[PDB]
Amino acid sequence: SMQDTVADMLTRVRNAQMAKKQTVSMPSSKLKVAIANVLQQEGYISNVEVAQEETKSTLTITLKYFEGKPVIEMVKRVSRPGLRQYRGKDKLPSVKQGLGIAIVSTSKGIMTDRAARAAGIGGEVIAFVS
Amino acid sequence: ATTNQLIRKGRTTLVEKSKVPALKACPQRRGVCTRVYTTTPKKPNSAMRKVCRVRLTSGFEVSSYIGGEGHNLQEHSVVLIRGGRVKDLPGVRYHTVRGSLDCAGVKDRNQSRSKYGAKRPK
RNA sequence: CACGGUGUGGCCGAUGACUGGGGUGAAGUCGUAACAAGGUAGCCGUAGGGGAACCUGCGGCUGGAUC
RNA sequence: CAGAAUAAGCACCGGCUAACUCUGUGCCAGCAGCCGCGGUAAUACAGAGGGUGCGAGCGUUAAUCGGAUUUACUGGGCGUAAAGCGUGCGUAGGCGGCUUAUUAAGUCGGAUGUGAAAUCCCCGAGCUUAACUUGGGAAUUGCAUUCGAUACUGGUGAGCUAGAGUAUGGGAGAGGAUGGUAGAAUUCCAGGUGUAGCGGUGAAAUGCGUAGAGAUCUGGAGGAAUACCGAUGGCGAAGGCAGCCAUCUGGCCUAAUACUGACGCUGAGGUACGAAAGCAUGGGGAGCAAACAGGAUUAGAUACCCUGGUAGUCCAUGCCGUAAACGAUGUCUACUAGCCGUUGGGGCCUUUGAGGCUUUAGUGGCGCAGCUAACGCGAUAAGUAGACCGCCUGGGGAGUACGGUC
RNA sequence: UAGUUGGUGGGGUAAAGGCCUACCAAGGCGACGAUCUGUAGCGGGUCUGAGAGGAUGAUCCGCCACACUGGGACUGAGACACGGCCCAGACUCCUACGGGAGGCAGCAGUGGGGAAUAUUGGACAAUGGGGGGAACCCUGAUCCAGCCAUGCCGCGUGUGUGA
Ligand SMILES: NCCC[C@H](N)CC(=O)NCCC[C@H](N)CC(=O)NCCC[C@H](N)CC(=O)N[C@@H]1[C@H](O)[C@@H](OC(N)=O)[C@@H](CO)O[C@H]1NC1=N[C@@H]2C(=O)NC[C@@H](O)[C@H]2N1
């Protein structure tokens, strides 16, 4: 059965980018919305929309391409239900020497690894993006 | 293997076995020559190799190779044996130290004398 | 209560007339089972038979050539 | 104070690996960490000359970690190289849909106490230098208490319907169990016609036949299996399931409403089923046929071929638990170009009846991207990801021995 | 697993406590591995490794345990006491056969084992320890010396010229 919806979202994004889609849609949740907002702020995607027709809600992401290649070259789930990963402020991972971003869930919200370092807090490492 | 499988059962490590069990982790061993004889090598080698059967202080009964040209060993000699394989004589895993206890140093040598135990000629 | 004794059992090691299979060496003897459709396609399970590779029955596979 | 006066060896030179020739010997003597040298021009054996590396040391043996991503947490694999249990169900456990309030266990941050000295590291100091000694730091990645944060995970309360399940209509099927029945054919028996062969092989022979065979026609007995349909078709968890009819019975597909409201996925132990052969008790026995007998072939034939033929193959009730039990590919979930078939349904469109578009659940052929050592796989993945389980660690010895369970 | 798990009365100890005892109850531990069995002193540290890990626990420091093999207690603030006592066991020694004696895993040393590891040395001058008012006495702790290329570091075995 489906037990990791965050990994499902990342996999949908990766497959859509590999298939050169312009738009990718999925069932929505607040966690996926926060992750998509972080990606949009960092510039990996263009637009984030949420359509709430009924009790069901659909999340839509607009993808970006640049010089014939997708902007997101690597997206990797790090913490998983079978093995959760938590790091302190001094052990936050760096993605290819700072040219990437590690998405971190902290007690002050979802933010990037450098933002978490600036705020001096740790948390759960959700994904690596580059 | 999944993380849960690793937690339930770890990673096993296979212990190694010594190639010189008769030494019993010692650098050398004393022994008494039970037999002094000659054997033939395996293919593609052909020669007449000088071997002894030695009873060690460890309790084992092994075979050792005599190196160099010319040896004075006979049955009931007291010798010192170290590790070392010949690789052309099956079942021979040890060497006899020339010039230690009853083994004499090889004569007429002037190169590589420390092996074969030949003192420096004047 | 320590040590000791008696009876009866369990476990560990050593040793033993004789006996079974295994490996290595060397090519002495009998055959030619497999590799080509290997000259009866091969192999798997099982059962019976035979100096020996092996043979035959029943079911299965293609990891079988040619039509 | 006197005088160069008292003071230099060890390993190696085929490649890995810096350093090459000559004599002696001729698979001998010997060398060897691995690959390998030696059988008359040996840079690989022994000596010599020369050189190379170290140097009061130089080599060998033993031992630990490394190289070894060669147990892979960091950081590996299982179609064919070793590796998916034969297949299901399910216990403990692991993991688990969306919204919201709360809690602060996991998680994160601060403060305080502690984490002996020595040791490691840094800056100095004293040894004629260095080893060594020593001052001060840094470090001791940890533990405990207490105060905070609430994104995620967990707990609790409430709510929801996209997962899962229930009721009602309709449909396809060799799905399973029991009983009955029909037609073709083989064998045997009796009879009619009728007379010298029949059968078998590469060729023969064993065998059958003048007390009459084989052939042909009529009538009886019995057992086993279901031609054509028949299909890259169908059904079943797998093993497997084919004439027709009735009875009992499981699953699946399909439409729209209504209903419950996460009731789910996987699954160590466990348990159920599980081809063929085999075993036990009692029946049955046409055909076929291990064992066996005879005839051939052959140097021999124990076999392949031929004539016979017992167990068995069949039924009832139980056991056994193994197969190249194979897609050599564990189960569940989501996503990722297209083209052409076929099976069971739903919808729409033409216009009178047969076609054309779609959609869904199976079953096939190609093939973009991606993957792979290659072969190849490619929406029925061996692609992209997640959850759980099983398994592998050079070839033999060996799925073997001892012990144990059945 | 049957003082076994808990409770009550009593005993006992410097002190909590099944530590002991008499009753009452049926409890307690175990797949997060009880019971049984093999091996093993533990740590600060040491070696290796980029790290994570792996191996190791000489010399220095902390803790524990043992003192020929087992069982006890006495004295004392403190021991169930290496060079104290009692009992049992094995072994060794003297004897005039009456009777006695002993425990190097302290330092040195002997025999044996092994591939292999040293002197039957000096002084209490220094730092400590015991006794004493002190003088001072004792101290194989210690400080030194002897032996070994075992390791690390340093130095020498000559320098210039000379075809
Ligand atoms: N989701 C669940 C669905 C379950 C269902 N199973 C569907 C499924 O999942 N299928 C997966 C496909 C895997 C397939 N089994 C592998 C394969 O096909 N060969 C194995 C690989 C061997 C080799 N690398 C290729 C090879 O030699 N090929 C031959 C070849 O082309 C040709 O032979 C000759 N002489 O020219 C042909 C004619 O016979 O035979 C093929 N060989 C075969 N053809 C058969 C076939 O397809 N199947 C059964 C078996 O018989 C197969 N062997």
* B3 close to A (CB below 8 A): yes
Measure the CA–CA gap between A68 and B94, rounded to whole angstroms. Answer: 69
| CB of B24 lies under 7 Å from some atom of strand C | no
Name residues whose C-beta falls within 8 Å of residue B112's C-beta, 6 or more positions apart in sequence.
Answer: none
Tokens 């020559």 found at: B33
Q: In strand D, which positions have an atom below 7 A from any protein CB?
A: 9-12, 27-39, 46-48, 58-64, 71-73, 76-77, 93-100, 106-110, 148-153, 160-163, 264-265, 332-337, 369-370, 383-393
3-state class percentages of chain A: helix first, strand second, coil last, to nearest 5: 30, 35, 35
- Radius of gyration from C-alpha coordinates of chain A: 15
| Rounded (10°) angle between helices A30-42 and A5-18 | 40
* Count of structural domains, chain B: 1
Cβ-contact A105, A115 below 8 angstroms: no
3-state class percentages of chain B: helix first, strand second, coil last, to nearest 5: 5, 30, 65
Measure the CA–CA gap between B93 and B62, rounded to whole angstroms. Answer: 8
Tokens 């190196």 found at: B67
- Neighbour tally for A11: CB within 10 Å: 14
| CB of B8 lies under 7 Å from some atom of strand C | no
Resolution of this model in Å is 2.2
User: What is the A55 CA–ligand 1 centroid distance (Å)?
Assistant: 48
Domain that holds residue B13: 1-122
Measure the CA–CA gap between B72 and B40, rounded to whole angstroms. Answer: 20
Residues forming beta bridges with residue A45, ordered by sequence position:
A63
| CB of B43 lies under 7 Å from some atom of strand C | yes
Measure the CA–CA gap between B115 and B122, rounded to whole angstroms. Answer: 18
Residue of B nearest to A84 (CA): B3
| CB of B42 lies under 7 Å from some atom of strand C | yes
CA of A111 to C1' of D137 (A): 38
| Cα A41 versus chain centre, distance | 11
Q: Which amino acid is at A23?
A: T
Measure the CA–CA gap between A82 and A51, rounded to whole angstroms. Answer: 31
Domain boundaries defined on chain A: 1-72, 73-130
